[PDB]
């Protein structure tokens, strides 16, 4: 069939039966407030395939998924809209999945899906494939993402890059999003993914046959899709063309430019000779005084009107390209008899869309007698009063405030065209809030001289002589740290502001001294003159210097951090560190110095066989005030010295320091050292200017190398000779190279078991090269020896055999 105007299903699931036959609807489809929610799955409707207006579902408590109701809904043309939207599913308390798996093309509107408690599978389907301008969609308030978890069967399903993601795309747990490959391009495609005729839209029952098209992307007539409907066929409701047999019999019509409409448009009027003649004004009527405009649904009510005898208030919060559509509906207005106002229209970038507005007669005015009013347009960059087009206000005041991105001169430029200066005070057209972020007209100041040092900058600029020297009041200098040249005046006001006054002497050009700047750093600087913007409005010329880049000279740095060292192998020592705390310039390298520190001559003076002392034993939490004070104090402490190390300390540039320099890495290894001998490691830290200014001071450490195991052991065999009084002398060689030192020797001996033990001092060996064991008992004996070095006891010597004669 072809359903009559609209179909509103409500009260109970029974009445839904009205859709039982219908295949295309020339109107909206409302399914609302089926509170009983009982019958549920008792109804099906495969006939519906095309809806020529929006589709709305509201609080149908008993339904699970639209796939049960409308399996074959293929195109929602959206020739009208429901508040910018062609499909709305709101407060569906029990809806789990959308469905509509055959839906393939939405023509005009966006989609709103909101407050659906348990609707998953949202954003899991690539909407850019079904409609353009995905930015105008609005999905919020639904079931939180992490709770359910979208899936397709086997998740084994069709894929693409969903936004920046890459995943399956799921209408519902049982059905993937039926999509055919890109090979068809702009064309439609049938089951098995074969491309059909370029006039089929959505599905298509046969490949490349005009009649098989389910719907027509341009027009439908006599069961055949056609890019333009045949001659003598009048476009009706924007999807089918008819003849006078039809338009003449719809309940109250006219014809014009092939369109069948309810009335003739502007510039054409009824001619009584025949009803068809829309022979070459149009007035909207008012019921409210204030005809607020917020959406294309409300703006479309004005389509075709020449004279609007009401009040306009514009509050367009959002919309990427709504301005394009408002032109077609409102662009034909030429007279607004009442006041005009704007409010939070954060979407408007230009009032150009109001193409043919001329007059604002001000028959009614806001409180305070304003006839044109603009306030808090956070993005209104442009008014429409270019000199090419006229705007005449016949009475009333103006007012402007909080227009951050509207340049104030533009308001004054418009102020001139209407010729309405003699009605406003400062507050109405103040410069202190209206337009303080948009540039344009400006003299140019010329920096005459620049002077720089390591911590200060001095600049001067030419004498700005405005057309009236009294206009200038002062000069303001802006500057901030700017390592890179991608900087603009409007980067946040980070910009430091300084005030400077023109010196009373008129022979000296002004200038400034800036102090407290970081050395070796890039600073941006520009100049804006301050003038009294009044009496001659835009003729107060204003001045702005160009952005100038300055870098102040340089000085010196700091040292190596986390200097650490250890020993992994004999004659080798591993050293690590980090970059210094404040390079104050490009680091280049490190310097490593090392030195032997003597084996303790302080220590081979001690007789360790003699007395030795007894061993004594064996979501960031807050911060309390007092704390703050404490970690302040330590700060002042550590700052009190640094200004000492400075005074630009300037390192121009028993055993001497061996030296080397680091190439690329904050770690180094020094090898081929004397084993177990103590050393010093000293490291400087250098910058690219340390080659001339000198390299930072040192953080140093000591190291004792790994000993050569057994090197402290006796390097030869033990020798024994008899001595009087049944005494025995044992002569052995001293270890040529000790592990730091030879401290002691220990001898264990005995007659049958080596019970005897004694301590032999180093000095005793020095005097005699050995020791005399005296007053031994008669009998045979055996004996071993353990020199003790600084790295621990050596290994015991080979057995020494000697005897004492009883006779």
């Amino acid at each position: 069939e072809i359903c009559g105007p609209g179909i509103d299903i409500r009260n109970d699931y029974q009445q839904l039966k009205r859709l039982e036959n219908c295949t295309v609807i020339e109107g909206y489809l409302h399914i609302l407030l089926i509170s009983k929610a009982e019958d549920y799955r008792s109804y099906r409707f495969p006939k519906l395939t095309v809806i020529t207006e929006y589709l709305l579902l509201f609080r149908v408590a008993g339904l699970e998924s639209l796939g049960d109701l409308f399996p074959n809904l293929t195109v929602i043309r959206g020739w009208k809209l429901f508040y910018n939207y062609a499909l709305v599913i709101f407060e569906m308390t029990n809806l789990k999945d959308i469905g509509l798996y055959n839906l393939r093309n939405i023509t005009r509107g966006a989609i709103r899906i909101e407050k659906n408690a348990d609707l998953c599978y949202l954003s899991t389907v690539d909407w850019s494939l079904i409609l353009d301008a995905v930015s105008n969609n609005y999905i919020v308030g639904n079931k939180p993402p992490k709770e359910c978890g979208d899936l397709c069967p086997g998740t084994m399903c069709e894929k693409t890059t969903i936004n920046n993601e890459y995943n399956y795309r799921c209408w519902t747990t049982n059905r993937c999003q039926k999509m055919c490959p890109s090979t068809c391009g702009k064309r439609a495609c049938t089951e098995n993914n074969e491309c059909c005729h370029p006039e089929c839209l959505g599905s298509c029952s046969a490949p490349d046959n005009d009649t098989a098209c389910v719907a027509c992307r341009h027009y439908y007539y006599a069961g055949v899709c056609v890019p333009a409907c045949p001659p003598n066929t009048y476009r009706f409701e924007g999807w089918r063309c008819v003849d006078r047999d039809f338009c003449a019999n719809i309940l109250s019509f006219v014809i014009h430019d092939g369109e069948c409409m309810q009335e003739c448009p502007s510039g054409f009027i009824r001619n009584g000779s025949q009803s068809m003649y829309c022979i070459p004004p149009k007035v909207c009527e008012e019921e409210k005084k204030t005809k607020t405009i917020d959406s294309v649904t409300s703006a479309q009510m004005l389509q075709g009107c020449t004279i609007f005898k009401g009040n306009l208030l514009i509050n367009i919060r959002r919309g990427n390209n709504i301005a394009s559509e408002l032109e077609n509906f409102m662009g034909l207005i030429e007279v607004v008899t009442g006041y005009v106002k704007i409010r939070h229209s954060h979407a408007l970038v230009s009032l150009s869309f109001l193409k043919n507005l001329r007059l604002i007669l001000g028959e009614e005015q806001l409180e305070g007698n304003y006839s044109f009013y603009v306030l808090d347009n956070q993005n209104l960059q442009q008014l429409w009063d270019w000199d090419h087009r006229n705007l005449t206000i016949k009475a009333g005041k103006m007012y402007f405030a909080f227009n951050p991105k509207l340049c104030v001169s533009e308001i004054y430029r418009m102020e001139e065209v209407t010729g309405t200066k003699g009605r406003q005070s400062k507050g109405d057209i103040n410069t202190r809030n209206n337009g303080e972020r948009a540039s344009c007209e400006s003299d140019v100041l010329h920096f005459t001289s620049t002077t720089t040092s390591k911590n200060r900058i001095i600049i001067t600029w030419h004498r700005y002589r405005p057309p009236d020297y009294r206009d200038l009041i002062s000069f303001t200098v802006y500057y901030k740290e700017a390592p890179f040249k991608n900087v603009t005046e409007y980067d946040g006001q980070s910009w430091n502001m300084v005030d400077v006054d023109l010196p009373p002497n008129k022979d000296v050009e002004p200038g400034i001294l800036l102090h407290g700047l970081k050395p070796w750093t890039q600073y941006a600087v520009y100049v804006k003159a301050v003038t009294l913007t009044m009496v001659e409005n835009d003729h107060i010329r204003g001045a702005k210097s160009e952005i100038l880049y300055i870098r102040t000279n340089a000085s010196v740095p700091s040292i190596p951090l986390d200097v650490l060292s250890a020993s992994n192998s004999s004659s080798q020592l591993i050293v690590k560190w980090n970059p210094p705390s404040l390079p104050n310039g490009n680091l280049s390298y490190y310097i490593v110095r090392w030195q032997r520190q003597p084996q303790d001559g302080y220590l081979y003076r001690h007789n360790y066989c003699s007395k030795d002392k007894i061993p004594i034993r064996k979501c960031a939490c807050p911060k309390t005030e007092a704390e703050k004070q404490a970690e302040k104090e330590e700060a002042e402490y550590r700052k009190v010295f640094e200004n000492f190390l400075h005074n630009s300390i300037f390192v121009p540039r028993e055993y001497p320091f061996f030296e080397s320099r680091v190439d690329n890495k904050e770690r180094t290894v020094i090898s081929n050292l004397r084993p177990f001998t103590l050393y010093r490691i000293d490291i400087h830290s250098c910058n690219h200017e340390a080659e001339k200014l000198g390299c930072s001071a040192s953080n140093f450490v000591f190291a004792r190398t790994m000993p050569a195991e057994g090197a402290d052991d006796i390097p030869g065999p033990v020798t024994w000779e008899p001595r009087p009084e049944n005494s025995i002398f044992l002569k052995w060689p001293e270890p040529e190279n000790p592990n730091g030192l030879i401290l002691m020797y220990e001898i264990k001996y005995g007659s049958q078991v080596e019970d005897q033990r004694e301590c032999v001092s180093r000095q005793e060996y020095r005097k005699y090269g050995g020791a005399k064991l005296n007053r031994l008992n008669p009998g045979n004996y055996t004996a071993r020896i353990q020199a003790t070095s600084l790295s621990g006891n050596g290994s015991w010597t080979d057995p020494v055999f000697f005897y004492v004669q009883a006779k």
Binding site: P5, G6, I7, D8, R10, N11, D12, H30, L32, L33, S35, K36, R59, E91
Partner: peptide, 30 residues
């Protein structure tokens, strides 16, 4: 019903509890 100001979801719930069944309409026939 409540003697306070009705709005939004509360409005819808109160309206249902007042009317109930078979009483509440939007008429395409008009």
């Amino acid at each position: 019903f409540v003697n306070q100001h009705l709005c939004g979801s509360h409005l819808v719930e109160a309206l249902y509890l007042v009317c109930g069944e078979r009483g509440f309409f939007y008429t395409p026939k008009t």
